[PDB]
Amino acid sequence: EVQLQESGPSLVKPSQTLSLTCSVTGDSITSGYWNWIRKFPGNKLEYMGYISYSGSTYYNLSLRSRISITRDTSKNQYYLQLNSVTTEDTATYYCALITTTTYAMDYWGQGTSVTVSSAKTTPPSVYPLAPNSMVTLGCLVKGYFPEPVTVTWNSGSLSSGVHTFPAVLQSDLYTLSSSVTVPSSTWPSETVTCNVAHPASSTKVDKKIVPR
Amino acid sequence: NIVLTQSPVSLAVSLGQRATISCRASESVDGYGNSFLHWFQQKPGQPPKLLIYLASNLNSGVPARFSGSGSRTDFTLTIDPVEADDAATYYCQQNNVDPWTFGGGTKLEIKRADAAPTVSIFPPSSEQLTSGGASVVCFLNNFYPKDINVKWKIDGSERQNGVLNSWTDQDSKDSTYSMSSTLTLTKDEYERHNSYTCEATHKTSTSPIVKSFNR
Amino acid sequence: QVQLQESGTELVKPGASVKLSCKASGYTFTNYWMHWVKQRQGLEWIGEINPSDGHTNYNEKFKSKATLTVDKSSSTAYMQLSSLTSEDSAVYYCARPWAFGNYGAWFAYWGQGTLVTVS
Amino acid sequence: GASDIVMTQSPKFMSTSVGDRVSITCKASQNVRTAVAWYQQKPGQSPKALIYLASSRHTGVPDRFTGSGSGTDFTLTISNVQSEDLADYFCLQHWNYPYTFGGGTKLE
């Protein structure tokens, strides 16, 4: 049961070097082919390259002179370096494995968002949204940078009936909202809280939704 | 360089019925007895997941509802029957020839029954107000089809600037869509008006669906 | 290290046949195809074999001259050269592709070569 | 066969002084995209890969060796030529069967 996990900065200045790490657990990187892939904000996927079990590398033609992939077999980690990044390198970066069972990228990390910008990290303000068989409540997460932000309700206990909307960028600040619908029997009888995290600013907020 | 072209770029298929999507390669992806052409499903907020490898092999644990065929430069992914959970974008990928590439993706929509948006409007919170800002929020939730328009009115008059909108992808459970619209004003502007209104126009309704509150 | 160890120098009478070998180590033998190459002054690709299933693909120029086989248990590839003439005097190499697929087909690891002299 | 790809390699041989930069070209008779590798071969030794996929350097090869090109025109450039570089050089295409080599260049 191999597991891959990307880590590294979420925000990088233009012209600087982007560096990411993939930490592998379960399987040794001395087997298979260890890949980096990215997905642009417009959703297109681009294959970047690999380092093989033997240490050989394959760099995709369009990145061939800007990229380096290295590894550390003792730590079971491998690494991406992308040089002289521009705003066009903003993307979600994935590490994935190819085994010779399928010759296909068969196991994938959850991906890490990297933003290339000179804009500054800014924490969000979180506002409760409060007002029939069902009642809909919400949270407004406003004015943060960069992506991403995570929102849960009741620490994830409240799952169904949740909509968290894609963030909208305005003046280099993002704004996102999330709605949750619950039986009117349960609110405000039982508390409803949104939990908002923004790793880039080390922000974690809990906002209890209170009747007006 | 080799290019993978997927078609259609999007399609809507009824629950229980067949999706057929195509991938054409500009150069042959066959080599050494294999077609190095693989198919992936990518749901929002998730990484791609391998469905079919080497053109026609079911990846371990994947439903046999998914099947792949083809060779050389012409490939097909078939999904039959389509289920709600299949709302996703589908990608082909080749690794026979440098440069390795992905197709541009095919978005599969589930064609379900029409459903009117549930609209809810929310005044600015005292938290934001005490800080000098005023955002009025409107949720237009669980509708189908995805086409929808929102209009804001303040004291009966349409307001256009200060509005930001966001749309979800299709829900994996009920096959609906949702939209969020925020009208942001200054506290001072917000306090000199009484009626705040958000209106949805949608195929399911001959009149706009309106929610309001007076300050 | 990947290593391909080929058999020793051969002296072959005209019209006779010879079978060369290439013992592979330092990688999983059956996960890679094997190529063979002839050098008299330039190089010519003879053909390739998949050790996993024995499938072969030949350069048409050598279809009537070379026969490739493998012994999976011993991680050894073989090339039989038939009915030799002086034109077959050459150094023959075995070589392993870098990786899979066509992009990976380039010959990354070579044997030391085997001299064959017809006389 | 008439459809076999021909790799036309030039020059046939050359001489230079230590420290100099030299270039070897290969012209493919058909579009082979980037599926071209370059090899070095010393007398009595097997070929050793220098460059693969037209422009990537094989493990351990010094950056004095550079490859460029795509389609039909490919170049191997050797900068700061050293005594160790006196040898034969060959290109290989692996775009389509049969795989074929350039005729070679002797650097002496």
Numbering used by the authors:
A (entry chain H): 1 to 82, 82A, 82B, 82C, 83 to 100, 100A, 100B, 101 to 126, ...
B (entry chain L): 1 to 27, 27A, 27B, 27C, 27D, 28 to 211
C (entry chain A): 1 to 40, 43 to 52, 52A, 53 to 82, 82A, 82B, 82C, 83 to 100, ...
D (entry chain B): -2 to 105
Please, what does the article write about this entry?
AP33 is one of several bNAbs that bind to a highly conserved region of E2 (residues 412–423). AP33 potently neutralizes all genotypes of HCV in vitro. We use AP33 as a template to make a structural mimic of its antigen-binding site (paratope), by exploiting the ability of the immune system to generate antibodies that are specific for the paratope of another antibody. We applied a mutagenic strategy to identify a specific Ab2ß, B2.1 A, which requires the same binding residues for interaction with AP33 as the viral antigen.
To verify that B2.1 A is a genuine mimic of the E2412–423 epitope, a Fab fragment of AP33 was co-crystallized in complex with a single-chain variable fragment (scFv) of B2.1 A, and the structure determined to a resolution of 1.8 Å. The asymmetric unit of this Ab1-Ab2 complex was composed of one molecule of AP33 Fab and one molecule of B2.1 A scFv. The structure unambiguously shows the positions of all the amino acid side-chains and of water molecules at the interface between the two antibodies. CDR-H3 of B2.1 A complemented by water molecules mimics the shape and character of the E2 epitope, even though there is no sequence similarity. B2.1 A mimics the shape of the antigen particularly around the critical E2 residue W420, which is deeply buried in the Ab1-Ag complex. The hydrophobicity of W420 is conferred by several aromatic residues in B2.1 A while W420 itself is mimicked by FH98 of B2.1 A in the Ab1-Ab2 complex resulting in the loss of the hydrogen bond. The shape of the antigen around G418 is preserved by the side chain of B2.1 A YH100A, which forms extensive contacts with WL96 of AP33. The polar character of E2 residue N415, which is deeply buried in the Ab1–Ag complex, is conferred by the sidechain hydroxyl of YH100A of B2.1 A, which also provides a hydrogen bond to YH50 of AP33. Interestingly, the interactions of L413 with AP33 are mimicked not by an amino acid residue but by five water molecules in the Ab1–Ab2 complex.
